[PDB]
């Protein structure tokens, strides 16, 4: 899929004195330019290229390259239509997560995040072509209860928290707060024993441990409360599979009674006519026995 938000580059430290075609010449070698936006006041712009790879070479080749007195700053623009999705089965695949989230709009990209051994973490990223497509997917799954498997685990759709681990927090930016140079008066060191800071170091280690102890206490809470919901909803399922066998068996008994009463109706019509045959047989005997009496007493 060509010219996605993943193909979109940011370019900072542009001269205020540039044209949209001067900026387009910069990326001439990387083929037909797509979406272009400039903001001459704030000396930065956006370009879209055909493929993610073209963007990757372009970023690589043009970052920290001069633009008439300024060193350019080329990064990937932060996807403005991206979503976090958590509470996934370890079987939900990238392909499935995509298929599932296709129902909300056009899927630029869908990944489930895996650990060092390739196992699923139950977190994943969904990137939509349009902001609307994400807003739709967010509002719908936040109200509704979107499942992705046999097991009724709902998916938790939040907006994506985009953290910068490339440029980070450089010193020149940190210096803006006067509290930085104050705090840096002491240099990095190990708290030596006998100092008054050493004591409070260890009291901070005590608080950090208490935090990690209390947070693993929440993980236990969740794990024991879901194993209470596994047995509480699986026993309302064997009550529903008994209420199925209860109704189904009472229908087979009611229809049996019916067809047994039809087999009775039929038996009574057989018994009815076989009686009426024997009723005539004995009727005719009487007539012909008594008609014989009537011809004898006539002579």
């Amino acid at each position: 899929k060509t010219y996605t938000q993943r193909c979109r580059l940011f370019v900072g430290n542009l001269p205020a004195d540039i044209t949209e075609d001067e900026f387009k010449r910069l990326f001439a070698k990387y083929g037909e330019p797509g979406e272009v936006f400039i903001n001459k006041g704030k000396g930065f712009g956006f370009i879209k290229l055909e493929s993610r790879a073209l963007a990757e070479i372009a970023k690589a080749e043009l970052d920290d390259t001069p633009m008439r007195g300024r060193q350019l700053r080329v990064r990937f623009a932060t996807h403005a239509a991206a979503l976090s999705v958590r509470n996934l089965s370890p079987y939900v695949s990238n392909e499935l997560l995509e298929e599932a989230f296709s129902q909300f709009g056009p899927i630029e990209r869908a990944v489930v995040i895996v650990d060092d051994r390739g196992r699923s973490t139950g977190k994943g990223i969904v990137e939509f072509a349009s902001k609307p497509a994400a807003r739709k997917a967010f509002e719908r799954c936040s109200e509704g209860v979107f499942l992705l498997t046999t097991t009724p685990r709902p998916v938790i759709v939040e907006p994506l928290e985009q953290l910068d681990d490339e440029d980070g927090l450089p010193e020149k930016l940190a210096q803006k707060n006067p509290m930085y140079q104050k705090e840096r008066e002491t240099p990095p060191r190990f708290a030596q024993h006998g100092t008054f800071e050493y004591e409070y170091s260890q009291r901070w280690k005590s608080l950090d441990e208490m935090e990690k102890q209390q947070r693993e206490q929440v993980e236990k809470n969740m794990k024991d409360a879901k194993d209470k919901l596994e047995s509480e909803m699986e026993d309302a399922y064997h009550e529903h599979q008994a209420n199925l066998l209860r109704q189904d068996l009472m229908r087979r008994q009611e229809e049996l009674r019916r067809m047994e009463e039809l087999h009775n109706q039929e038996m009574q019509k057989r018994k009815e006519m076989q009686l009426r045959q024997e009723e005539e047989r004995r009727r005719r005997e009487e007539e012909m026995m008594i008609r014989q009496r009537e011809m004898e007493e006539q002579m």
């Binding site: 990757e56 070479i57 970023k59 690589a60 080749e61 932060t78 089965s89 695949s93 990238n94 392909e95 599932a100 990944v111 489930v112 995040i113 895996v114 650990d115 060092d116 390739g118 973490t121 994943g124 509704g144 209860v145 979107f146 499942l147 498997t149 046999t150 097991t151 009724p152 709902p154 910068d164 681990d165 980070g168 927090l169 450089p170 010193e171 930016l173 930085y180 104050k182 705090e183 840096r184 002491t186 990095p188 060191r189 190990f190 708290a191 008054f196 050493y198 409070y200 170091s201 260890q202 009291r203 280690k205 950090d208 208490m210 209390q214 929440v218 969740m222 879901k226 919901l229 909803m233």
Partner: protein, 240 residues
């Protein structure tokens, strides 16, 4: 810095007749080559290029290139000596982190992770050129109390939790067992109000809300204890 682990490429699907010299030829376009590792029988290796820039280009230009039957798999090598630092000070820089952790050995790179509003997340990344340096740092910062600035609350160094949001979990690598098939019967559907599954999966959507309200109490618990501890310490510094 040059010849850092961050310009180190894993190459996979190499032919069995691969030589240390042909892998150098293959990457000849991308200037000086540092260390080369090759396992011919297994058809994978490591090539370390001058700069990240040349490794970024080499990766894109050579990933999926055909070579004697298979298409090459070129990736950036997982860093072997990367740490996560937590409980960073309120006032902190990339430069402070590099300087602080250079005590344990060569630091290739250090980063204070920031949100989109430019404020630090409280996490940072320290990448050493070698595994021993990372080992010392990790060990000494566990037993010792390591302090970057005046404020005497120590940093917490963990091994890097290396995750993948590039490839993810593709269908081909998912395991095809009994539980797989059972899970993969009912398709992705919005559970309709009143059904078995709806009031089942309305308990989940509460279990996560309370888990988050619990995780927000821990937040408040530890904030109050932090505040309290700062004050006790202010006062104890006044004992000359």
């Amino acid at each position: 810095k040059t010849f850092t682990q961050r310009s180190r490429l894993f190459v996979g699907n190499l032919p069995p007749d691969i030589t240390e010299e042909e892998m150098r030829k293959l990457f000849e376009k991308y200037g000086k080559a540092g260390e080369v590792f090759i396992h011919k029988d297994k058809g994978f290796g490591f090539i370390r290029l001058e700069t990240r820039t040349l490794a970024e280009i080499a990766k894109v230009e050579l990933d999926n290139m055909p070579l004697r039957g298979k298409q090459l798999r070129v990736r950036f090598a997982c860093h072997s000596a990367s740490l996560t630092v937590r409980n960073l000070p309120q006032y902190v820089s990339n430069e402070l982190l590099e300087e602080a952790f250079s005590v344990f050995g060569q630091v290739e790179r250090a980063v204070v992770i920031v949100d989109d509003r430019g404020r630090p997340s409280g996490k940072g990344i320290v990448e050493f050129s070698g595994k021993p340096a990372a080992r010392k740092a990790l060990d000494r910062c566990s037993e010792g109390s390591f302090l970057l600035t005046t404020f005497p609350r120590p940093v917490t160094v963990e091994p890097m939790d290396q995750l993948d949001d590039e490839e993810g979990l593709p269908e081909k690598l998912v395991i095809k067992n009994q539980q797989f098939h059972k899970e993969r019967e009912q398709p992705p559907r919005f559970a309709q109000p009143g059904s078995f599954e709806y009031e089942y999966a309305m308990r989940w959507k509460a279990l996560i809300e309370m888990e988050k309200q619990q995780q927000d109490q821990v937040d408040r618990n530890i904030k109050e204890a932090r505040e309290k501890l700062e004050m006790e310490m202010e006062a104890a510094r006044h004992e000359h």
